[PDB]
Amino acid sequence: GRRAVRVWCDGCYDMVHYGHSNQLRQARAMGDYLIVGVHTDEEIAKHKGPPVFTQEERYKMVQAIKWVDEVVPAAPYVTTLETLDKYNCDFCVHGNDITLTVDGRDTYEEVKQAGRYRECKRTQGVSTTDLVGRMLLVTKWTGVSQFLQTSQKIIQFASGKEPQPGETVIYVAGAFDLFHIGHVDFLEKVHRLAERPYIIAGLHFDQEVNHYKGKNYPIMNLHERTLSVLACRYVSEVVIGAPYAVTAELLSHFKVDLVCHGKTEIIPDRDGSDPYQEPKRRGIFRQIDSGSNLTTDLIVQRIITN
């Protein structure tokens, strides 16, 4: 038995994207166990403006990412040894920003001098601001994203497991754009539908999403959406470019036991047909209620306050 390295992060985690998730993956790789501190609405307000998502929304999203072992709510804004000592955490991990006080001293001086501060690289291809811009475009399809996808980035995000005997294969599908607490609440309930679930998430092509969603959607592209969704602990695997209709070929290919959709509107397939007709014919379709009303369109409207 080796001695366990417990690891700390903190931040606002306000509108979580695959950069947040890649930093948490990276931080968790540095030890055995990741704890994450998230600040309150009130606390974020004192330093920046108030955040787009409420604390309990933010606590829940972070908790949903597979590298995170626990979420400490109302974490202080600035990391301290008092906090590290209090959660038995060997060291903290931040991305490499310039973090200086007004007089030129380091915000994390205490921690750095104690030898208890580690850095990870910033994730390429994304930031909340970049995303704010993508939303502004949509409200006022060839591709505004310059994320560079690789096999290695997918290897790092994927759990990498084939369905074992006894596991109940469950397929779901959609846009999964701006992967959010609504999708998490949906997937987390789907995950209750069996003892040992193996959830596969079909991700519609960008061209398809633009067609059925109008405008400049999707905000995120298939590759980005791939990682967003693989970061979720309830997901075992992803179809990267799934058809809109849940075909026979697909169900048979993945040996699907079960198919779900949430309480959102199902838009008819181009020929008028129910794209879930085939699993309903087999009697393996089941509708689920997430309990969330959150959609990509509501995230846009909450994120633009002018």
Distances in Å between the Cα of 153 and the Cα atoms of 22, 23, 117, 173, 240 are 9, 12, 25, 22, 14
- Report how far residue 217's alpha carbon sits from residue 299's, in angstroms, rounded to the nearest whole number: 13
Instruction: Tell which one of 127, 264, 273, 301 touches ligand C5P (CB under 6 A).
Output: 264
Number of residues that bind ligand C5P (CB under 6 A): 16
263 makes contact, choosing from ligand CTP, ligand C5P, none, with CB < 5 to 8 Å by partner type, with ligand C5P
Residue 158, judged by CB atoms within 10 A of its CB (0-12, 13-18, 19+), counts as middle
- CB count within 10 Å of CB 121 equals 10
Positive or negative torsion for Cα 162, 164, 165, 166? negative
Q: How many helices (H) and strands (E) does the chain have?
A: 13, 10
Residue 175 touching ligand C5P (CB under 6 A) = yes
256 binds ligand C5P (CB under 6 A): no
Does 156 engage in binding with ligand CTP (CB under 6 A)? no
Query: Which position among 44, 65, 71, 126 is part of the footprint of ligand CTP (CB under 6 A)?
Result: 126
Among 82, 97, 195, 265, binds ligand CTP (CB under 6 A): 97
Q: Return d(Cα 66, Cα 18) in angstroms, integer.
A: 12
Mapped onto helix, strand or coil, the DSSP state of residue 284 is coil
- Residue 51 in contact with ligand CTP, rule: CB under 6 A: no
Q: Binding to ligand C5P (CB under 6 A): which residues in 111-150?
A: none
User: With respect to ligand C5P, which residue has the nearer C-beta, 145 or 296?
Assistant: 296
Asked whether 18 and 60 are in contact (CB, 8 A), the reply is no
- Total of residues contacting ligand CTP (CB under 6 A): 15
Which of ligand CTP, ligand C5P, none interacts with 12 (beta carbon under 5 to 8 A by kind)?
ligand CTP
- 68 CB-contact burial (10 Å; exposed 0-12 / middle 13-18 / buried 19+): buried
* Sheet containing 258-261: order of strands: 237-242, 197-204, 168-174, 258-261, 285-287
Binding of residue 299 to ligand C5P (CB under 6 A): no
Residues 20-39 that bind ligand CTP (CB under 6 A): 20, 23
In the DSSP assignment, the letter for residue 85 is H
Question: Is 213 flagged in the annotation as binding?
Answer: yes
294 near ligand C5P (CB under 6 A): yes
Is 58 or 213 the residue whose CB approaches ligand CTP more closely? 58
Taking a C-beta distance cutoff of 8 angstroms, is the pair 66, 34 a contact? no
Which lies closer to ligand CTP via its Cβ, residue 129 or residue 293? 129
Query: Considering only residues 253-292, where is the footprint of ligand CTP by CB under 6 A?
Result: none
Select from 87-95, 229-237, 250-258, 288-296 the region that touches ligand C5P (CB under 6 A). 288-296
Query: Which tokens is 226 given?
Result: 């791939």
Can residue 19 be called a binding residue for ligand CTP (CB under 6 A)?
yes
Q: How far apart are CB 103 and ligand C5P at their closest, in Å?
A: 47
Please give the residue ranges that form the binding site for ligand CTP (CB under 6 A).
11-13, 19-20, 23, 94-95, 97, 122-123, 126-129
Output the known binding site. 175-176, 183-186, 213, 261-264, 290-294
